[PDB]
Point group: C2
Amino acid sequence: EYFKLYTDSQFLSPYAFTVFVGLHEKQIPFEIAAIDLLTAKVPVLEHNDFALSESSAILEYLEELYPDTAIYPKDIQARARARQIQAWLRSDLVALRTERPTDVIFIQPKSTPLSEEGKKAAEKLFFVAEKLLASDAEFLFGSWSIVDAELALMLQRLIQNGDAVSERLKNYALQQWQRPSVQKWLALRHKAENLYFQ
Amino acid sequence: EYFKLYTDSQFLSPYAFTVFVGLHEKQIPFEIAAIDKVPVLEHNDFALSESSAILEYLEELYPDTAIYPKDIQARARARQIQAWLRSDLVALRTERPTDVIFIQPKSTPLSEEGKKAAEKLFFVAEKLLASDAEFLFGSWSIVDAELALMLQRLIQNGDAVSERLKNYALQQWQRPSVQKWLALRHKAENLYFQ
């Protein structure tokens, strides 16, 4: 009955993005607020008297609260695979996340070329996404899941910065970006920055 | 019916460790192979990686032997602490790799940010272990073993750790599932390497 989402004030967080998308897809009404820089970091979800951080935890909690609007695949093995890709995006690809922060998607590209480890994460990303998206799939697991939004953002770190990305993966990412829930994030960023900063 | 777990050759992986602990607690028989990222769980025709995903998969297959708290909010906090230990504490996981627990302690002091990580960990652990608690969320859960291991990176390397936390880590480390893993490492020596 009461849901509030806390994001970073500049809306650069990929995990806040991910929870916002999850809430909108599940059509859960909620309020948003911003913080400047047992919870460590944004995003934090408050639900009545209960406050919760870490995006994967928050999502899992939302699925349990509302099981009939799943944002993970329904087959048990596809769901496991979805959790795997999600965990992998969160914790691996360290060089990529470091060298292409979300600043490159929302503000301006970085001049610096990918380091050797940077190039290696990008290729590993391309390998995995092209494997999971073979046969010209529109989504990773048949129909849309929150992991489509997470993968697209990851790819966008490269695309929006100018780095080399296959035509097939740009098409996937661009289409994912035009998802309405995502589009609602992108608009919110600009509107909120005009209000929050007096 | 058929499960196979793949760990790193030298049994240093905290994520393989966590999976190994979870299977044993749930009493799921499985075979173990070492490779020279892990862990990978193979279940019949299905291969799966990333430890959090593997545990959620095992919970969905065997809901009766649960290793997450029953209460939904407690379970969410469990998933939170588990996610945080996976991704945060970065200075600590680099400066105190699991080598210091299973093989040899390190002499290198502990970087500035290394100290900060250790401090966040203490703070979080002291909060969750309110009063006299044996386990984080009342009954044992997988997050106990995960938090015990993280603490062990400090205890086993000598580094200063509140006595309240040692008795927690010590008690968790004496669990048979954790003990089987300690015994695995040695016995894979005379086997695997010929």
